[PDB]
Paper text:
CI-producing bacteria produce CI glucanotransferase (CITase; EC 2.4.1.248), which catalyses the production of CIs from dextran by intramolecular transglucosylation, and also catalyses disproportionation, coupling and hydrolytic reactions. CITases and some dextranases (EC 3.2.1.11; displaying endo-dextranolytic activity) are classified into the glycoside hydrolase (GH) family 66 (GH66) based on their primary structures, according to the CAZy database. [name] uses CITase (CITase from [name] (PsCITase)) to synthesize CIs from dextran. The core PsCITase structure is composed of four domains, the catalytic domain and three β-domains.
Numbering used by the authors: 40 to 739
The structure:
C-alpha cells in the first residue's frame, strides 16, 4: 500500500527568456512507513498540445519528503505560457506554470515588499521572495515605503550611505535588507520596482535642495501649498507641480539614484488622486491631470538614457473608472511599461470594472493592466469573540451606548490592574489578525498592553473618536499561532493610559469567495491584481504594511492555482491579439442555469473572446452573489453537468473543445466530447460543462 502526495511543484525562476533552461521541482512526500520506488513522469503542455515528456525512477524513504527535479530547455519562441505536470502515480500529482517572456511588462504579476527591518536576514529576505515567485509566479515586486524621505530617497552622511534610516511612520529601514531583497528578486528573474511619488517632498524641503517656487497651491497668492497633514504638527508631505521642469530635474535624479545605487529595475510612481482648483506659485491655474503625462514621459526618457535595461516605469491612475480623472490622459499618452490603477468606488460592479479595463486597453494599444483593488476593505469579518462574554478582571459589562454587537460591551476599563481575556480557537498554524472593536471619547489616545498565551506581545494604541457611540475596529495586531486554544489578553498595566470600551475581538480573515471571483473577473477581462506580498501577506488597505486581515490556507491554495492558471493560459488571457468577440449575449446558452452576458447578479456570466487561433468562452459563476467585486461573498451555487451551446460562424473551423479551470484538476486542460448542429437561432457547438464553481474557461 504505497501512499503520499505531491505537496508543491515549482520552477526555479518566475519568468524565462526563450531558450533558458527551466528546472522544475516536485516536493514529493511518502506517507507510508517504508520507502517507495517508482516512476515520476513530467508532462509539459502548451494549451491543448503535449510538447515534452520525461521520466525517472526515484526512491523516497518512509515519512520523507524529497525534491524530484527535471530540467527542460524552453522553446525558442517568445511569450508562451506552459503547464508542467508531475505525476508520481500512487504518491499523487501536481502542476506548475512556466512563463517564457523576454519582457515581464507583457505579463506582469505584481506583488509587494513593505518590510525592510534590520533583523531580517538574507535567508528570510530570500524565503519571502522565493515563496511568492514559486507559489504565485510573481515576476515583479513593488518596494513600498523603502525610501527615507519622499524627495531624498537614500539617506547619506556625506558620501557614506547610512546603514539604517527612519521613515515617515518612524519605521527602521535597513539598506542591506533592501539590497538583499532586490538580489533575491533578480535571482527569480524578477523586476524590483521602487515606490516613489510623482510630486511629494517632506517637511523642511528647502534644506534638501527643493524650491518652494516649484510647489502647487490652493490659491493664486502662493499662501497655502497643497499638503498631507499626518496630524502630529510636524510630519507633512508637500505637493509640487509635475509639469515644472526643475521639479522634474530634481526628482528624476532621485529616481536615477535609486536605480543606480540600489539596482532597482524601475520606478513605481504614485499619486494622491483628484485635486481640483490648483495653481502654481505665480497664481496660474493648472489643468492638473494634464501635467502627469509630460512628467512620466520625461521620466521614462531620463531613465532610458541612464540604463535601458533598468528603465521601467508605471504610474498609478487613482480612482479608476471609464473617463476617470487622468485616466484617458495617462493610458492614451504616457509611456508606462504597463498600466496600473487603484480602484475605489467609481467602478463598483464587475461590468463597470470590465468596461474600465477595456478602455485602458483600447487607449493604450493593449498594454497590460494591473489593478490595486483592496479586497474586503474595512469589513470586520472573521471569527468573532464578544468582549462581554470573555474573562473580566476589574472591568464590567454594560449596554448604555449605541453600536455594540452581541448583548453588550466591556466598560470600567480605566485603571491599572484591569484586563479583558479572550479565549480563542484557531483551526490551523498560521498568521491571525487580532482586530479589536472599541470606543474612546477620552479626548486622547488610550493604550493597552497585549498578551498572548500569558506572554507580552506589544503595546496597542486606541485612537480617540468624536463620541462614545462612534466605534472603531482600526486597532489590530497580527500574530503567528499553532492550532487549537490560545488566550488573548488586553491589559491596563501600570504606564498605560486612557479609558476605553471594548466590544469584541475578531480574527480578521480575507474572504476567499469574493477574492476568487474578483481575480477571475479581472483575468477574464485582461487585467491582473496587485494583492500578494511579503510571506504570503495580502493587501487589506492602501498602507501596505497593514495586517488587519490574514489569509487562511484554503485561500492560499486557491491563489496558487489561480496565479498558475493565469500564467499557463496567459496567451489566451493577456496577449495583445486577445479581443472581445463582437456578438452579444445570445452567443451562449446554458440549459436550465440562469446566465447573463453582462455580469448580472446571481447568474453564470459568460464572456466570449478570441485570438487569431482560438475562440474562448469564460464562465464566471455569480450564482448566489451580487455584482459588486470588493465585498465579501457567499460560496457560489455549485453547478454540475451544464448542457452548453456556443453559437459560432458557419465558416469557423473546429478541431476539439478544451476546458480548463483554476478550480479543478490542477489547471490541466480537458478535451470534452461535443457535437455540432444548427437550430432556429443559428450554428452551434454543444457540450457538457462537468462543473462550474468560480471560473471555467473553454477554448477551441
Ligand atoms: Ca459586544
Ligand atoms: Ca459581490
Ligand atoms: Na440559461
Amino acid at each position: 500500500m504505497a501512499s503520499g502526495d505531491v505537496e508543491r511543484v515549482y520552477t526555479d525562476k518566475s519568468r524565462y527568456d526563450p531558450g533558458d533552461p527551466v528546472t522544475i521541482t516536485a516536493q514529493v512526500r511518502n506517507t507510508d512507513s517504508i520507502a517507495w520506488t517508482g516512476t515520476v513522469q513530467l508532462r509539459i503542455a502548451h494549451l491543448e498540445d503535449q510538447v515534452h515528456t520525461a521520466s525517472q525512477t526515484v526512491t523516497i524513504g518512509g515519512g520523507q519528503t524529497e525534491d524530484v527535479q527535471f530540467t527542460w530547455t524552453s522553446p525558442a519562441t517568445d511569450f508562451k505560457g506552459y503547464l508542467a505536470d508531475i505525476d508520481a502515480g500512487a504518491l499523487g500529482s501536481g502542476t506548475t506554470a512556466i512563463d517564457v517572456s523576454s519582457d515581464f511588462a507583457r505579463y506582469p504579476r505584481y506583488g509587494y515588499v513593505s518590510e525592510f527591518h534590520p533583523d531580517e536576514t538574507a535567508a528570510e529576505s530570500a524565503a519571502k521572495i522565493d515563496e511568492l515567485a514559486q507559489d504565485y509566479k510573481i515576476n515583479a515586486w513593488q518596494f513600498y515605503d523603502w525610501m527615507w524621505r519622499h524627495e531624498t530617497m537614500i539617506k547619506r552622511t556625506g558620501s557614506a550611505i547610512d546603514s539604517t534610516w527612519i521613515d515617515l511612520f518612524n519605521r527602521e529601514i535597513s539598506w542591506q535588507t533592501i539590497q538583499n531583497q532586490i538580489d533575491a528578486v533578480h535571482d527569480q528573474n524578477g523586476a524590483a520596482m521602487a515606490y516613489a511619488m510623482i510630486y511629494a517632498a517632506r517637511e523642511d524641503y528647502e534644506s534638501y535642495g527643493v524650491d518652494s517656487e516649484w510647489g502647487i497651491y490652493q490659491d493664486p497668492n502662493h499662501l497655502q501649498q497643497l499638503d498631507v497633514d499626518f496630524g502630529n504638527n510636524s510630519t507633512y508631505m508637500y505637493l509640487f507641480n509635475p509639469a515644472n521642469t526643475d521639479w522634474q530635474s530634481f526628482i528624476h535624479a532621485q529616481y536615477l539614484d535609486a536605480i543606480n545605487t540600489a539596482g532597482f529595475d524601475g520606478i513605481h510612481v504614485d499619486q494622491m488622486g483628484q485635486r481640483n482648483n490648483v495653481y502654481d506659485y505665480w497664481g496660474n491655474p493648472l489643468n492638473f491631470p494634464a501635467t502627469f503625462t509630460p512628467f512620466i514621459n520625461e521620466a521614462k526618457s531620463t531613465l532610458t538614457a541612464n540604463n535601458s535595461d533598468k528603465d521601467r516605469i508605471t504610474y498609478n491612475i487613482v480612482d479608476g473608472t471609464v473617463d476617470g480623472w487622468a485616466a484617458n490622459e495617462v493610458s492614451g499618452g504616457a509611456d508606462v511599461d504597463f498600466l496600473y490603477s487603484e480602484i475605489w468606488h467609481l467602478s463598483d460592479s464587475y461590468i463597470q470594472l470590465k468596461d474600465y479595463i477595456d478602455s485602458l486597453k483600447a487607449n493604450s494599444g493593449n498594454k497590460a493592466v494591473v489593478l490595486a483593488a483592496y479586497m474586503n476593505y474595512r469589513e470586520n469579518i472573521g471569527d468573532r469573540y464578544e468582549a462581554e462574554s470573555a474573562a473580566l478582571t476589574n472591568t464590567a459589562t454594560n449596554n448604555n451606548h449605541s453600536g455594540y454587537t452581541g448583548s453588550g460591551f466591556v466598560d470600567q476599563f480605566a485603571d491599572p490592574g484591569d484586563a479583558v481575556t479572550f479565549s480563542i480557537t484557531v483551526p490551523e498554524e498560521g498568521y491571525y489578525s487580532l482586530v479589536f472593536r472599541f470606543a474612546n471619547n477620552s479626548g486622547f489616545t488610550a493604550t493597552r498592553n497585549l498578551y498572548v498565551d500569558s506572554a507580552f506581545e506589544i503595546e496597542l494604541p486606541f485612537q480617540n473618536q468624536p463620541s462614545w457611540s462612534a466605534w472603531s475596529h482600526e486597532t489590530w495586531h497580527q500574530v503567528y499561532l499553532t492550532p487549537g486554544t490560545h488566550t488573548i489578553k488586553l491589559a491596563y498595566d501600570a504606564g498605560n493610559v486612557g479609558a476605553i470600551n471594548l466590544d469584541s475581538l475578531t480574527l480578521g480573515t480575507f474572504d476567499p469567495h469574493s477574492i476568487r471571483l474578483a481575480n477571475a473577473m479581472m483575468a477574464a477581462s485582461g487585467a491582473t491584481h496587485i494583492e500578494l506580498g511579503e510571506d504570503s501577506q495580502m493587501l487589506a488597505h492602501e498602507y501596505y504594511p497593514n495586517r488587519s486581515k490574514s489569509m487562511r490556507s484554503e485561500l492560499k491554495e486557491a491563489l496558487k492555482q489561480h496565479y498558475n492558471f493565469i500564467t499557463a493560459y496567459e496567451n489566451l488571457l493577456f496577449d495583445p491579439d486577445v479581443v472581445d468577440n463582437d456578438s452579444g449575449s445570445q452567443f451562449v446558452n446554458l440549459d436550465m442555469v440562469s446566465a447573463s452576458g453582462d455580469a448580472s447578479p446571481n447568474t453564470v456570466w459568460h464572456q466570449v473572446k478570441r485570438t487569431p487561433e482560438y475562440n474562448i468562452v469564460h464562465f464566471i459563476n455569480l450564482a448566489n452573489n451580487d455584482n459588486q467585486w470588493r465585498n465579501s461573498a457567499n460560496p457560489p451555487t455549485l453547478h454540475t453537468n451544464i448542457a452548453t451551446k456556443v453559437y459560432v460562424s458557419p465558416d469557423e473551423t473546429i478541431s476539439g473543445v478544451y476546458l480548463a479551470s483554476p478550480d479543478h484538476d490542477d489547471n490541466r486542460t480537458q478535451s470534452l466530447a461535443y457535437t455540432t448542429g444548427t437550430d432556429i437561432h443559428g450554428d452551434y457547438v454543444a457540450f457538457t460543462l462537468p462543473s462550474l464553481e468560480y471560473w471555467s474557461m473553454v477554448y477551441m
